[PDB]
mmCIF file of N, CA and C in Angstrom:
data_model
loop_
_atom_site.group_PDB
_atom_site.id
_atom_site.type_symbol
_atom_site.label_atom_id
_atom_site.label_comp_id
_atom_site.label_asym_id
_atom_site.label_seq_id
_atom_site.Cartn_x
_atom_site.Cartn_y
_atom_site.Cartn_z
ATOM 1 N N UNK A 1 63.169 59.078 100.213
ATOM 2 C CA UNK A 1 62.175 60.056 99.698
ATOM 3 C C UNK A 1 61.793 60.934 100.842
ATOM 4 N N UNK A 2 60.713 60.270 101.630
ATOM 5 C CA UNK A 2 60.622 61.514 102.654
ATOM 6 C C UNK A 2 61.405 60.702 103.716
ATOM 7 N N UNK A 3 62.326 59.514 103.948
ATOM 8 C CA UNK A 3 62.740 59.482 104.474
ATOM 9 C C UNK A 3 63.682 60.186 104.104
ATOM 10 N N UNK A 4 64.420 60.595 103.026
ATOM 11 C CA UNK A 4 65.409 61.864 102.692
ATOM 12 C C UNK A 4 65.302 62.916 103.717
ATOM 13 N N UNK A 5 64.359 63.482 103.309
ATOM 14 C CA UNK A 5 64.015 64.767 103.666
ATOM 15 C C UNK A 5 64.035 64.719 105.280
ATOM 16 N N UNK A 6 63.350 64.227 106.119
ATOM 17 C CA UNK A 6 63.093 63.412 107.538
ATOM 18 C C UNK A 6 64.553 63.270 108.017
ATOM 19 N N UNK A 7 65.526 62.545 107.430
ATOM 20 C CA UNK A 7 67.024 62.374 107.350
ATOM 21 C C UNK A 7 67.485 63.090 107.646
ATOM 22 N N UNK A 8 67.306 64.427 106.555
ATOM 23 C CA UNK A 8 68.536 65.064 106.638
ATOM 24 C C UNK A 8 67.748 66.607 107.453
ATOM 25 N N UNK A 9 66.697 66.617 107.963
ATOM 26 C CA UNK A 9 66.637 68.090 108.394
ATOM 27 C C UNK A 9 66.820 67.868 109.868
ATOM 28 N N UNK A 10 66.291 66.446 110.660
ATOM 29 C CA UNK A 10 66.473 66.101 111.510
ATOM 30 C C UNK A 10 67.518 66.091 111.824
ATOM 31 N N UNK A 11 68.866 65.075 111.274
ATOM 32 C CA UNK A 11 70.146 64.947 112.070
ATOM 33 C C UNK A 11 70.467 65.968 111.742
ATOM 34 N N UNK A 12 70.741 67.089 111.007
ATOM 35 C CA UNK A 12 71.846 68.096 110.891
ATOM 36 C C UNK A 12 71.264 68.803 111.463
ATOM 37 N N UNK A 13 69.873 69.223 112.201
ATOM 38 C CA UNK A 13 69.439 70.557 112.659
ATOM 39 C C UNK A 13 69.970 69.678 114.423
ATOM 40 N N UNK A 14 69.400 69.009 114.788
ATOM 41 C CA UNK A 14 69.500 68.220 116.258
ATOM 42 C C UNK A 14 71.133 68.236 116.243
ATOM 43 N N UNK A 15 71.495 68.764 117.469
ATOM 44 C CA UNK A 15 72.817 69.494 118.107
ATOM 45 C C UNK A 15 72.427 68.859 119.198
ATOM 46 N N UNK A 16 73.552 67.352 119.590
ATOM 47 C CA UNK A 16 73.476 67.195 121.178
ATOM 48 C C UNK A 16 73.912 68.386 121.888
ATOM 49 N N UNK A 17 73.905 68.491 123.363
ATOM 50 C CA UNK A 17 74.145 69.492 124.475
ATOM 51 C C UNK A 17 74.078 68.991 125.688
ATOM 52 N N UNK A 18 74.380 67.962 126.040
ATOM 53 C CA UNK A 18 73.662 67.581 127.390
ATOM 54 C C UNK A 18 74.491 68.162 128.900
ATOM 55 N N UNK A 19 73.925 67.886 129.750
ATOM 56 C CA UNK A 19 74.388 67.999 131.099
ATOM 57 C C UNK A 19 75.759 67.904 131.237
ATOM 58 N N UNK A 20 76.380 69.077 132.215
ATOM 59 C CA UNK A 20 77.749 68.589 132.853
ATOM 60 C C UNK A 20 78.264 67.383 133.745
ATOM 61 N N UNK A 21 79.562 66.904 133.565
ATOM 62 C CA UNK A 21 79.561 65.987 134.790
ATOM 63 C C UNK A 21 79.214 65.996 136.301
ATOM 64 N N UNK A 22 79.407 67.741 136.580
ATOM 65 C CA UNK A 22 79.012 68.284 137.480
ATOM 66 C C UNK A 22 77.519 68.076 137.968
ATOM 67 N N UNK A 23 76.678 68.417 136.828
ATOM 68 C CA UNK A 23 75.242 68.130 136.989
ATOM 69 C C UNK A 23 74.581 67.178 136.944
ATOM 70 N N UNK A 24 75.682 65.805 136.190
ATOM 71 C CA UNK A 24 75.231 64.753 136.468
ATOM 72 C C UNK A 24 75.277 64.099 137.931
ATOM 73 N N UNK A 25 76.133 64.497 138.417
ATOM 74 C CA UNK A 25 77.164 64.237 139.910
ATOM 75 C C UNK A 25 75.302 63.961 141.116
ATOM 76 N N UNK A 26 75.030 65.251 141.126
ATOM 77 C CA UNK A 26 73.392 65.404 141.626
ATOM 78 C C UNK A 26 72.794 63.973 141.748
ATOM 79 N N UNK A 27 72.388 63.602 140.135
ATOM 80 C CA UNK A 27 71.735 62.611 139.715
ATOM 81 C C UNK A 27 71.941 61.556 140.359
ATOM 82 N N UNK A 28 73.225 60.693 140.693
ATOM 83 C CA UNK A 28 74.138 60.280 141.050
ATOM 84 C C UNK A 28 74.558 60.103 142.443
ATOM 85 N N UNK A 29 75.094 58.817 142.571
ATOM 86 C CA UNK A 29 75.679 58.812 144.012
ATOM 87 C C UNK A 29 76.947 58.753 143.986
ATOM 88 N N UNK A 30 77.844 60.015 144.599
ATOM 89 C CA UNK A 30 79.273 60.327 144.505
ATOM 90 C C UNK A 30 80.281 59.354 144.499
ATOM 91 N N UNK A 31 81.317 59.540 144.094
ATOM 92 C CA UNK A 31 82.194 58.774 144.570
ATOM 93 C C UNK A 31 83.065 58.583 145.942
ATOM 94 N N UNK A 32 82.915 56.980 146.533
ATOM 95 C CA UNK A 32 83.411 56.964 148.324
ATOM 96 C C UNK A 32 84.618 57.070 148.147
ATOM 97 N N UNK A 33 85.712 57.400 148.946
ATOM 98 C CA UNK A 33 87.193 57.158 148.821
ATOM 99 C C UNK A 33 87.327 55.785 149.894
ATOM 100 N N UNK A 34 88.464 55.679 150.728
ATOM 101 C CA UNK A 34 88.784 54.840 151.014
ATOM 102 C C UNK A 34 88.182 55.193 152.603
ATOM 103 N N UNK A 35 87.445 54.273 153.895
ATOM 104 C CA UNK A 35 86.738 53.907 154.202
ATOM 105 C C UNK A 35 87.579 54.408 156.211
ATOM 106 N N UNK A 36 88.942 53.656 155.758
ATOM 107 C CA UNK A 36 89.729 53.802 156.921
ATOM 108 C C UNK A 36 89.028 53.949 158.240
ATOM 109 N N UNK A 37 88.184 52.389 158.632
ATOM 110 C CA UNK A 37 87.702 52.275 160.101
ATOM 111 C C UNK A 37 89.220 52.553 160.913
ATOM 112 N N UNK A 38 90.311 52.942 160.879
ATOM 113 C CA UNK A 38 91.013 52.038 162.039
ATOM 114 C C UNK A 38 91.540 50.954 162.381
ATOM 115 N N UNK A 39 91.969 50.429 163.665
ATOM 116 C CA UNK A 39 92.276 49.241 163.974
ATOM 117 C C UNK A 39 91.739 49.373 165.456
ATOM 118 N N UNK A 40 90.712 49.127 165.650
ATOM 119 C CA UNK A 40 90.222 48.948 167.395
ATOM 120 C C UNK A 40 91.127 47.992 168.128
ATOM 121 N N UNK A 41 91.244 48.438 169.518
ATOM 122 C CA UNK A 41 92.029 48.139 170.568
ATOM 123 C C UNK A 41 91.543 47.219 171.372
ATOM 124 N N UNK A 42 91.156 45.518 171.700
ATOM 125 C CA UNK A 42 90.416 45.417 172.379
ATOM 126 C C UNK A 42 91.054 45.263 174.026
ATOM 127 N N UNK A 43 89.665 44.785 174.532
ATOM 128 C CA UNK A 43 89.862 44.338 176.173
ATOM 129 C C UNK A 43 90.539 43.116 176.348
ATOM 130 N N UNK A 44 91.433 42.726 177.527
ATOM 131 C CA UNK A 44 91.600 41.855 177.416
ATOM 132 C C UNK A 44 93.383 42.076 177.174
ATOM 133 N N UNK A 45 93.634 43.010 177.596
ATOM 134 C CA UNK A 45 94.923 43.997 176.917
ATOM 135 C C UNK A 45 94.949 44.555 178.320
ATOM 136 N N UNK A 46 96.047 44.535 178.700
ATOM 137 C CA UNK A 46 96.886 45.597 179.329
ATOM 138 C C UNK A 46 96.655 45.167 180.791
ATOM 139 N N UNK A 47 97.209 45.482 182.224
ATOM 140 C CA UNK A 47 97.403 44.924 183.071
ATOM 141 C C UNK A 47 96.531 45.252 183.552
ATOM 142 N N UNK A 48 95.088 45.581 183.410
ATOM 143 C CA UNK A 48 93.920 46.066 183.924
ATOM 144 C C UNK A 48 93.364 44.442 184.463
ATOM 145 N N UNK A 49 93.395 43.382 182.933
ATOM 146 C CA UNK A 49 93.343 42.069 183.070
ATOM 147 C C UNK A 49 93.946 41.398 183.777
ATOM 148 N N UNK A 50 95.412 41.526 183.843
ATOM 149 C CA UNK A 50 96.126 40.634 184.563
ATOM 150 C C UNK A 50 96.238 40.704 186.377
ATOM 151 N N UNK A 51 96.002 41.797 186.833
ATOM 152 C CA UNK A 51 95.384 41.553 188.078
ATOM 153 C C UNK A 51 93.822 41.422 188.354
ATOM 154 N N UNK A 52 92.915 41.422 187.499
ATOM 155 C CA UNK A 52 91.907 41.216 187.676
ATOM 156 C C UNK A 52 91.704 39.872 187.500
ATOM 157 N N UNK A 53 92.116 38.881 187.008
ATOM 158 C CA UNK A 53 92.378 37.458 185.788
ATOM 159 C C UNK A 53 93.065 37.050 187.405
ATOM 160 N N UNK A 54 94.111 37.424 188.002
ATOM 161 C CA UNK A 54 94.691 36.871 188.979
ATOM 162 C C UNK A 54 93.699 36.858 190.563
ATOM 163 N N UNK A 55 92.925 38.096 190.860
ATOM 164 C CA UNK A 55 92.112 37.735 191.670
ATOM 165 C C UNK A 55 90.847 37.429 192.089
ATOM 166 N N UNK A 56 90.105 37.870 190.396
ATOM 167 C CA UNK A 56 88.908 36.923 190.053
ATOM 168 C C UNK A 56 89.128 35.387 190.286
ATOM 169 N N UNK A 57 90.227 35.245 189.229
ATOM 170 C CA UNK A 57 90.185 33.634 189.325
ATOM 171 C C UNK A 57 91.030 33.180 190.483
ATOM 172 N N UNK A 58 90.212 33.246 191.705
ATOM 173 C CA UNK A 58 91.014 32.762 192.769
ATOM 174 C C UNK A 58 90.010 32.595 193.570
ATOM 175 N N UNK A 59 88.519 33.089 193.329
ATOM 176 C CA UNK A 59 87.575 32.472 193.637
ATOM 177 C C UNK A 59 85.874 32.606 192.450
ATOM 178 N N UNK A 60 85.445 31.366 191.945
ATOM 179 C CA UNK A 60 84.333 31.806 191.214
ATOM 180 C C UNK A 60 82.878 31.059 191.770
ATOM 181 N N UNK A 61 81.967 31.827 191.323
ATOM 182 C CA UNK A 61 80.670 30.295 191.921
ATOM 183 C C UNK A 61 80.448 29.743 191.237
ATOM 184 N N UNK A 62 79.582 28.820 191.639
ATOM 185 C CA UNK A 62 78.799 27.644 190.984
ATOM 186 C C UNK A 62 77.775 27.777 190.401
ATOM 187 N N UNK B 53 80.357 8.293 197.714
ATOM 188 C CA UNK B 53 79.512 9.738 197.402
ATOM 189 C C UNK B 53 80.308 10.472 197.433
ATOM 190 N N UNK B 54 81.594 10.771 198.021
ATOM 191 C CA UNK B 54 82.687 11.609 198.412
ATOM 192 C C UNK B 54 83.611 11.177 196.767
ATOM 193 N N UNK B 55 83.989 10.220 196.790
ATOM 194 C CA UNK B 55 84.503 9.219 195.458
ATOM 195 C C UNK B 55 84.058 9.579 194.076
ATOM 196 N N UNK B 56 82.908 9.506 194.264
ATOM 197 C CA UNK B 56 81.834 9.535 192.961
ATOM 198 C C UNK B 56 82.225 11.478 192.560
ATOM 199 N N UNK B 57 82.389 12.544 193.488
ATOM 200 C CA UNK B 57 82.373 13.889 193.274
ATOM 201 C C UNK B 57 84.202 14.228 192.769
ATOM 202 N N UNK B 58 84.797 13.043 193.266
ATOM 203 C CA UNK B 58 86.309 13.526 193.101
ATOM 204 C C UNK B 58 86.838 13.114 191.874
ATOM 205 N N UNK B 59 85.922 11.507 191.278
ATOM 206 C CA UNK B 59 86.842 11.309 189.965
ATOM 207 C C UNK B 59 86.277 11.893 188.931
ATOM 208 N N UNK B 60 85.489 12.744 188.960
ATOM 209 C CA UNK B 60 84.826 14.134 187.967
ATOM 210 C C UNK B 60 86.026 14.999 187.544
ATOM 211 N N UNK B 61 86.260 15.614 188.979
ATOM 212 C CA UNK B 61 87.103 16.466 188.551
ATOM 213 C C UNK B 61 88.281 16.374 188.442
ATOM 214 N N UNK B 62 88.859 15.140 188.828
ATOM 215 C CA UNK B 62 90.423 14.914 188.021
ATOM 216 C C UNK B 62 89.846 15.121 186.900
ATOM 217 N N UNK B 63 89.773 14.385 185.765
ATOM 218 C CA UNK B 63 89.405 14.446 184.571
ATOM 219 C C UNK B 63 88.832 15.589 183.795
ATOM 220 N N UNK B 64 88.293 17.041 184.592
ATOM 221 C CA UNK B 64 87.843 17.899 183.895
ATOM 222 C C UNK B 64 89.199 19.355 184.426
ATOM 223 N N UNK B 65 89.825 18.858 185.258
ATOM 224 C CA UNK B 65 91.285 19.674 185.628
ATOM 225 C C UNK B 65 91.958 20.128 184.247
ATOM 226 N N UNK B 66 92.689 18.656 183.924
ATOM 227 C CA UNK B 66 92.849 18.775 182.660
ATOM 228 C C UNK B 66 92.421 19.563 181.363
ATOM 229 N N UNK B 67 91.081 19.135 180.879
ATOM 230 C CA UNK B 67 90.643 18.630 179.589
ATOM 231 C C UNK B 67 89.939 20.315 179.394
ATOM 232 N N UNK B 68 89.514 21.049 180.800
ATOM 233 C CA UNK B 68 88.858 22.342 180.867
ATOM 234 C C UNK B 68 90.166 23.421 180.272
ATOM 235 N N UNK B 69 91.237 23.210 180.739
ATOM 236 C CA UNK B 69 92.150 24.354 180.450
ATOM 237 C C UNK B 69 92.584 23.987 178.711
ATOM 238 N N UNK B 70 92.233 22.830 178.171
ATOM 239 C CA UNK B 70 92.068 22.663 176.758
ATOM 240 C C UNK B 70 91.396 23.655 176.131
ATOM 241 N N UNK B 71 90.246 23.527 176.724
ATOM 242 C CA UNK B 71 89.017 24.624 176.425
ATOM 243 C C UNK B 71 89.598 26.080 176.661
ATOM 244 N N UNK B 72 89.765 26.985 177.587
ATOM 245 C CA UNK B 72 90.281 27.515 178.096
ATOM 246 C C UNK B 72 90.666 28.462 177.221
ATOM 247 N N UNK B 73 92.567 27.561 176.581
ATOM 248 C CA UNK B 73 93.207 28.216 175.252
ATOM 249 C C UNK B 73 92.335 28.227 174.350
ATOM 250 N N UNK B 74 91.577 27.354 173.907
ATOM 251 C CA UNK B 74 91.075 27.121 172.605
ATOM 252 C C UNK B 74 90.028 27.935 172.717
ATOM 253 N N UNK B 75 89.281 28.826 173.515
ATOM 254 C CA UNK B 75 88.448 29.820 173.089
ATOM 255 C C UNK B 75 88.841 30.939 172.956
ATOM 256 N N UNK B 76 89.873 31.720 173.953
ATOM 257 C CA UNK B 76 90.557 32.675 173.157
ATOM 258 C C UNK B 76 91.371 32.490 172.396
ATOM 259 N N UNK B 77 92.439 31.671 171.989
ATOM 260 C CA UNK B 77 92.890 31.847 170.389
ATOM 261 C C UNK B 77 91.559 31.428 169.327
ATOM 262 N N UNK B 78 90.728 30.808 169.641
ATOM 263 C CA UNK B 78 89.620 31.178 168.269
ATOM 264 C C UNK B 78 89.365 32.362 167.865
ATOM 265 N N UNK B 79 88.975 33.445 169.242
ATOM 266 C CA UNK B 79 88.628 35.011 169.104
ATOM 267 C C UNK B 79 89.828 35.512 168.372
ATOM 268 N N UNK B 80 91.053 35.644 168.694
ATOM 269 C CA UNK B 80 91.743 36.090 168.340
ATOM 270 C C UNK B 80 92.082 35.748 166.457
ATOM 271 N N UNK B 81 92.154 34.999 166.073
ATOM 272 C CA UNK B 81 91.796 34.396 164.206
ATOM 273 C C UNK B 81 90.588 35.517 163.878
ATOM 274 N N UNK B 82 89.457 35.641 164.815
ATOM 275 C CA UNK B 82 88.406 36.233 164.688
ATOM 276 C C UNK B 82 88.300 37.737 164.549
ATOM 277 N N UNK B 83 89.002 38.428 165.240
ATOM 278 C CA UNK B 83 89.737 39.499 165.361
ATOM 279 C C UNK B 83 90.475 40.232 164.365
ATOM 280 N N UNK B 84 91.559 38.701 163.041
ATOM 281 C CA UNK B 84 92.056 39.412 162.018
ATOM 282 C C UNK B 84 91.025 39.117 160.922
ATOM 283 N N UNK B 85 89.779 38.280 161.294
ATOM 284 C CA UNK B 85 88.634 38.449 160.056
ATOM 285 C C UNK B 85 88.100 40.239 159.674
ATOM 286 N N UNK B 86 88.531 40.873 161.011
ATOM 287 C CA UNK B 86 87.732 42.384 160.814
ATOM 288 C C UNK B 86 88.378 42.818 159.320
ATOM 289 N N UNK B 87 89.743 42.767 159.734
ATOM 290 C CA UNK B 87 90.164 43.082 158.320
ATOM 291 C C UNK B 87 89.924 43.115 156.806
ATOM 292 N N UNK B 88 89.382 41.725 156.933
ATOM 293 C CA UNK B 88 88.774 41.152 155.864
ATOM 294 C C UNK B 88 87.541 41.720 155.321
ATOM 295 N N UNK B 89 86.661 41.972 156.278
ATOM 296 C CA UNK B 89 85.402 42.612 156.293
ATOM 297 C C UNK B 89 85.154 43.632 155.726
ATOM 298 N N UNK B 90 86.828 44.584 155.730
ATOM 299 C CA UNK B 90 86.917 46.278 155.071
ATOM 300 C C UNK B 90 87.202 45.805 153.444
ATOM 301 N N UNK B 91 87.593 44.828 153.708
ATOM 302 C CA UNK B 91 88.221 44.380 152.193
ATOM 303 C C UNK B 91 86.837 44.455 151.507
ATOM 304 N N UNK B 92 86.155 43.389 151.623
ATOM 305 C CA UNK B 92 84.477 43.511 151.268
ATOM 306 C C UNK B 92 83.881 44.797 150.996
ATOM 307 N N UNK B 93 83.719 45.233 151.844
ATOM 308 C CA UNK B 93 82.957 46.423 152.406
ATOM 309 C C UNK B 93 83.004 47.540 151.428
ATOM 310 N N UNK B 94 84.490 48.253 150.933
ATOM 311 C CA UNK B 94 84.378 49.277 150.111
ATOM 312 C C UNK B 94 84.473 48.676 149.016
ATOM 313 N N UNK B 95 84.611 47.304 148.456
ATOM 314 C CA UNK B 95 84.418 47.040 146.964
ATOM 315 C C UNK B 95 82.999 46.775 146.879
ATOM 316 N N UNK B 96 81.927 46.537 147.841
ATOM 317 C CA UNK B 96 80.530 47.014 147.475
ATOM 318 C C UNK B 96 80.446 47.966 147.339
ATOM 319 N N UNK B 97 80.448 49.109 147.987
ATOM 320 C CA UNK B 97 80.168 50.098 148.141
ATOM 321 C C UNK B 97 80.860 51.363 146.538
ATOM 322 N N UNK B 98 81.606 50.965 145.758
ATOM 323 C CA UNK B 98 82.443 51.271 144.850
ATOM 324 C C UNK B 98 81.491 50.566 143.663
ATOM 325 N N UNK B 99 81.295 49.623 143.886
ATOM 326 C CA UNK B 99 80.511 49.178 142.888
ATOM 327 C C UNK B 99 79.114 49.582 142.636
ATOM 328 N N UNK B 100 78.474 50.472 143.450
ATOM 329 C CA UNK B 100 77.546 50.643 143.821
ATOM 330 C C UNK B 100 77.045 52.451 143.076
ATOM 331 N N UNK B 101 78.611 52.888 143.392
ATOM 332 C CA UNK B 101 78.291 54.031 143.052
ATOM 333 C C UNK B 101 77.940 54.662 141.703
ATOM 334 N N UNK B 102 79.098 53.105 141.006
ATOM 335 C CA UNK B 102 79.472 52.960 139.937
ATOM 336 C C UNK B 102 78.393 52.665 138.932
ATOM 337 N N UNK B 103 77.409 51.893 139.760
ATOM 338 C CA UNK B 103 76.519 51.702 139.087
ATOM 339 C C UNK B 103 75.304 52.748 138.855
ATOM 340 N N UNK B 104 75.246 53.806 139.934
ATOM 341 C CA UNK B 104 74.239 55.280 139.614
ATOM 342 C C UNK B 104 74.798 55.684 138.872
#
């Protein structure tokens, strides 16, 4: 009855429209891609150690 | 007293260079955990976004 009426002027007049994905994007926290730290190099590498390793350890204290 | 200081360190000659290896190859296992860490890292971060 007047839910008829209520029914039908409402849904057929109401036209969604909403926001672009674009404008949702704002709202939103973007999308990360892939992160790519690297591969760090450590110490403990390269002959910087091996003469240091050879005349450190040839005398240490107590 | 001379005796008492010498049979110490026979026994830690040895048993120290045990130690020795066994703390840097631990670091090193430790080293390919970083890897692991990225693995983690951007599937939070993905999930996260996903969820705004």
């Amino acid at each position: 009855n007047v839910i008829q009426d209520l029914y039908l002027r409402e849904l057929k007049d109401t036209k969604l429209a909403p926001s672009t994905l674009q404008d949702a994007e704002g709202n939103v926290k973007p999308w990360n891609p892939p992160q790519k730290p690297n591969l760090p190099e450590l110490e403990l590498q390269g002959p910087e150690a091996l003469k240091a390793y050879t005349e450190q350890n040839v005398e240490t204290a107590h | 007293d001379r005796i008492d200081s010498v049979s110490q360190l026979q026994n830690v000659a040895e048993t120290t260079k045990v130690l020795f290896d066994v703390s840097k190859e631990t670091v090193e296992l430790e080293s390919e955990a970083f890897e692991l860490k990225q693995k983690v890292e951007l599937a939070h971060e993905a999930k996260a976004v996903l969820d705004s």
